């Protein structure tokens, strides 16, 4: 068989020029779109504000206009999904993860509009959902869409354009090219069998996707925490322990995200109305909290920098943590079109900080600075739950730019994935495509 | 399908034992990775303490230089040829191939021969990196623990062996991320699913890295401070630099292989005429390492110096040409030493050169050569060895200028592209091919 290898080696990394020029166009597109979704969600969350500022004086009128303005968006959200593509609901990656293994479909003619405008309304309303997966999925579909258009054959031009697309997606969502490429080659890919995916294409994809972003959002970052302090060697063990904490909690959260999916399902029994209704219900509760207590609502970013700086009293943190687990569980387990990736970055950040503070003074000799453990634990949930430490770390890194902390970030992240496996956790994203890919049969 | 649901729900469950091993392996590849680093130092140093001791007399100096070097080189090639002709060359291909069960992992042999061998080939100061040399000491250390505690399965095998190669490249550049990425992008079986435990590889790298840090904290390998940023209307200049590397990447790939043939004659496999031509080149290194330091040695020393723009354009061109040659000589001559690092040094020099031309051909971009240096520092690792993703994440960890990440990719990928588009090949695979093919024909 080695008589085969020698042949392959000498042939390695020769991807069809055409598959390439396409990863490039796909990228450019997933980019332009990735931006438009970003800009849109903004415009909305803003109007909603421009409307509270316009009812300033009257309070319960305010709280009402808040709730409704939100609820109305949420409804228009769930709806579009349920009435035109029940897949756009949930994160948005599993249906791509599975679409990679040819175990799910890529109906772009549908899911494009429904995931965009859908989430563009679910997020625009300000629910605890990220543009995370939502952009990934808009991604893949855009790839398949160009695939079909210029009609390209082969499993290579299929898996490729579809996988580069998902990546170019996660890239423009966090302006983190490396983390995108790494998400594919670590999570998205077929996690149980060699695949014909062109990594050189994926790159060109991410590259274009990222240029586009940069072209529209330069002069500012998503997260900015400035160069935090360094992390002494006799300090690393505290990151193993924080890594442990996430590892045990990672699975638990994984249950709640699935369970709540069942439980909440009753409350509408698949009925488009009682659903879209319970939709506007949660949606509204978001507008309301997004005002009465902003931390508990919205994506999560806003408060990231604020928590890393140590501006939230310990207590305040605990509240925000608990209040978030809940609101994130609600919005996501309730099949609303929106990611849970970002909200997890926000969750870890808060837990990490908390840990920080306890350490920051339980060991005055270490000269600790909570903010480090925040950066450490910011992709820790993305580790213990979704189980892709390598992508978590390289994501955090690109966003928080504190490479000095890289060692503690890993010892935490890995320390997590470890305790997670050691306690039965599972790739939250796979634990979804399972249930899904199952029920399709189960429904037989 | 129905199988899938089963697999998914079972994902990422690597045998606790395979893990606790990746951890010990790592600790070991670490301790060793360091000792090799410390050793090569001690030597390059004595050699100096000996020139300082013959200060006055010049041709006596130049001689003591050449010989002290040549003697090490000889003791180098020898050990290899007389006890493990595989320690010669980089050291990765025999691990790359060892991963596909197309080559062997004789650790009881290659450990001492690669260590002390290179610890003498590098200690003498030849244009060779501790790059692959450490990777290979790595893998072998994994297989060694594998055998010792005797673990079965293809997973317990491929894993400890692959984590080991990674923990290796990690302690060689103190770059954990780049190590993990080297495996999952270059080392791992390129054309067929494999049973490699990435969670293990990590634990491996982690331990390997702690060890390093425990012995080399308070200083970096490369330090270039926060360079300037890179404007969008500036990115195209990185595509063009990426093109330049892409065309040259294959060419260099030929020379590294060809020179391997050519130089082979000059000893015809004969342990003596080889070990002799060995001390020949080795000596030429001590000599140049003194008369013109840039042209010799690993390459690091001059990296920072070239990024700062301290070498006149001309001076760069010289150092480039002089380096292609000396790197080709030492590596194509089957001496036990990597060519990974020497390529980092090469790109850095080419990138800078490009820089300077740009730095003034476009006074309106407010350029700063040093950026293109960081950009092109892992550009050869891209156009030649073809692993842009590991190159980039390596440079990043070493030069810590994430701001430049976009230009670094547009260059790197821009290279791999022009390289493929011109027939280049994974220099490391283009070796295991030759190896594997000849080995039978």
């Amino acid at each position, epitope marked *: 068989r080695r008589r085969q290898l020698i042949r392959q080696l000498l042939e390695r990394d020769k991807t069809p020029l055409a598959i390439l020029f396409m990863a490039a166009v796909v990228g450019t597109l997933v980019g332009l779109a990735a931006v438009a979704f970003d800009k849109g969600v903004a415009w909305l969350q803003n109007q909603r504000m421009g409307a509270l500022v316009h009812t300033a004086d009257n309070y319960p009128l305010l709280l009402t206009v808040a709730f409704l303005c939100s609820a109305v968006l949420a409804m228009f959200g769930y709806f579009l999904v349920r009435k035109y593509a029940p897949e756009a609901g949930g994160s948005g990656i599993p249906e791509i993860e599975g679409a990679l293994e040819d175990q799910r479909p890529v109906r772009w003619w549908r899911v494009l509009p429904v995931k965009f405008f859908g989430g563009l309304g679910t997020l625009g309303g300000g629910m605890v959902l990220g543009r995370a997966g939502p952009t990934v999925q808009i991604g893949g579909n855009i790839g398949r869409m160009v695939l079909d258009i210029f009609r390209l054959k082969g499993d290579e031009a299929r898996h490729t354009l579809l996988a580069t697309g998902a990546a170019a997606g996660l890239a423009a969502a966090f302006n983190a090219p490396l983390a995108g490429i790494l998400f594919i080659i670590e999570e998205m890919r077929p996690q149980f069998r060699y695949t014909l995916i062109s990594i050189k294409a994926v790159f060109i994809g991410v590259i274009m996707s990222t240029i586009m972003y940069r072209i529209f959002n330069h002069e500012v970052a998503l997260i900015d925490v400035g160069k935090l302090s*360094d992390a002494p060697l006799n*300090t690393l063990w505290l990151y193993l322990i924080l890594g442990i904490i996430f590892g045990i909690f990672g699975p638990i959260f994984n249950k709640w995200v699935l369970g709540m999916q069942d439980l909440l399902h009753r409350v509408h029994g698949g009925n488009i109305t009682k659903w879209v209704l319970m939709g506007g219900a949660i949606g509204g509760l978001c507008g309301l909290l997004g005002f009465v207590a902003p931390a508990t609502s919205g994506g999560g970013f806003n408060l990231i920098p604020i928590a890393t700086a140590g501006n939230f009293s310990m207590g305040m943190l605990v509240f925000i943590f608990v209040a978030r687990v809940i609101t994130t569980l609600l919005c996501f387990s309730s099949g609303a079109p929106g990611g849970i990736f970002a909200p997890m970055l926000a969750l870890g950040t808060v837990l990490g900080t908390a840990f920080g503070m306890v350490a920051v003074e339980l060991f005055p*000799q*270490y*000269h600790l*600075e909570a903010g480090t453990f925040a950066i450490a634990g910011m992709g820790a949930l993305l580790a213990a739950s979704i189980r892709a430490p390598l992508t978590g770390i390289i994501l955090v890194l690109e966003m928080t730019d504190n490479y000095q902390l890289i060692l503690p970030m890993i010892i935490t992240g890995l320390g997590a994935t470890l305790l997670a496996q050691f306690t039965g956790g599972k790739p939250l994203y796979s634990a979804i495509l399972a249930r899904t890919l199952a029920k399709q049969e189960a429904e037989q | 399908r129905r199988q899938l649901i089963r697999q998914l729900l079972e994902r990422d469950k690597t045998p606790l034992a395979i893990l606790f091993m990746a951890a010990v392996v790592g600790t070991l590849v670490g301790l060793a990775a360091v000792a090799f680093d410390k050793g090569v130092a001690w030597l390059q140093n004595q050699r100096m303490g000996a020139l300082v001791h013959t200060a006055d007399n010049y041709p006596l100096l130049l001689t003591v230089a050449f010989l002290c070097s040549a003697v090490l080189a000889m003791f180098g090639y020898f050990l290899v040829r007389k006890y493990a002709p595989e320690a010669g060359g980089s050291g990765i291909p025999e691990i790359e191939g060892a991963l596909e069960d197309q080559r062997p992992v004789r650790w009881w042999r290659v450990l001492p021969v690669k260590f002390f061998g290179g610890l003498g080939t590098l200690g003498g100061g030849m244009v060779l990196g501790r790059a692959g040399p450490t990777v290979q000491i790595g893998g072998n250390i994994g297989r060694m623990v594998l055998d010792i505690f005797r673990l079965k399965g293809d997973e317990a095998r491929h894993t400890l062996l692959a984590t080991g190669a990674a923990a290796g490249l990690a302690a060689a550049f103190n770059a954990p991320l780049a190590g993990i990425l080297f495996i999952i992008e270059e080392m791992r079986p390129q054309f067929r699913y494999t049973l490699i435990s990435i969670k293990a590889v990590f634990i491996g790298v982690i331990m390997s890295t702690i060890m390093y840090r425990i012995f080399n904290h*308070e200083v970096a390998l490369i330090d270039v401070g926060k360079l300037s940023d890179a404007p969008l209307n500036t990115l195209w200049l990185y595509l063009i630099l990426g093109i330049i590397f892409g065309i040259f990447g294959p060419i260099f790939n030929k020379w590294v292989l060809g020179m391997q043939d050519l130089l082979h004659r000059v000893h015809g496999g004969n342990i003596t005429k080889w070990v002799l031509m060995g001390g020949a080149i080795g000596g030429l290194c001590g000599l140049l390492g003194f008369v013109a330091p840039a042209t010799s040695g690993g390459g690091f020393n001059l990296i920072p110096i070239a990024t700062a723009g301290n070498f006149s354009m001309g001076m760069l061109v010289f150092i480039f040409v002089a380096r292609v040659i000396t790197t080709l000589l030492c590596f194509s001559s089957g001496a036990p030493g990597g060519i990974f690092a020497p390529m980092l040094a090469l790109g850095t020099v080419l990138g800078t050169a490009f820089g300077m031309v740009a730095v003034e051909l476009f006074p309106q971009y407010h350029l700063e050569a040093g950026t293109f240096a960081i950009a092109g520092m892992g550009a050869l690792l891209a156009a030649s060895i073809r692993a842009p993703l590991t190159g980039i994440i390596l440079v990043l960890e070493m030069t810590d200028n994430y701001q430049l990440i976009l230009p670094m990719i547009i260059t790197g990928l821009g290279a791999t592209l022009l390289a493929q588009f011109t027939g280049g090949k994974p220099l490391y695979s283009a070796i295991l091919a030759r190896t594997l093919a000849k080995q039978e024909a």
Partner: antibody
Amino acid sequence: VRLLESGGGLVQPGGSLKLSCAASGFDYSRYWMSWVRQAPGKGLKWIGEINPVSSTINYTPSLKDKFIISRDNAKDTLYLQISKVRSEDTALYYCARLYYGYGYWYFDVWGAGTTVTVSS
Amino acid sequence: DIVLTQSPAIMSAAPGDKVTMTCSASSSVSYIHWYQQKSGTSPKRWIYDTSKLTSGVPVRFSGSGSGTSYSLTINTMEAEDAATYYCQQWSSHPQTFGGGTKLEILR
């Protein structure tokens, strides 16, 4: 890295003087700074330390505002405010930059020192 | 807070001579440090983390110990070792200091 300190002098018991540390030679931030003091031919004692973002100040066990350590990361200077000056405070005050290897912090680079003489 | 107790309060030795002094901890400690203080001069950091010589410390210098007792040692004590060493710790906050040991020359 040079550490120059000023402000030492004669003071009325009860008074309250302010000592300064002028740092030349290193990114003053990223660093911790602390005051150690040595009584007239006697042991060295640690007054206190203060980080970069000035968000953490610790002092050896002593009455609230017995000491006020502060830092201006815009002049790279470290200050020490001593109150209700007694006789014990008659000592040699040293400022130093804190740094470590493993994480068991040491007083990296010290400074010349300034004398505080407390007398009527 | 730990009480570092430097063993010999004083002592004398002749150039070219091995010398050892101590540091006794009121409790456990880890990786202590030693500073050399030249009469009328601002404290210089010598050994650190029980042993490491600071970039410049004469090689004849070393010392160490552990648990609850460390030491400074000079193998062949030259002249330029006229001063006082203070063993300081900070493994346990707040950091403390030994009463020092005075290295006086015998002649």
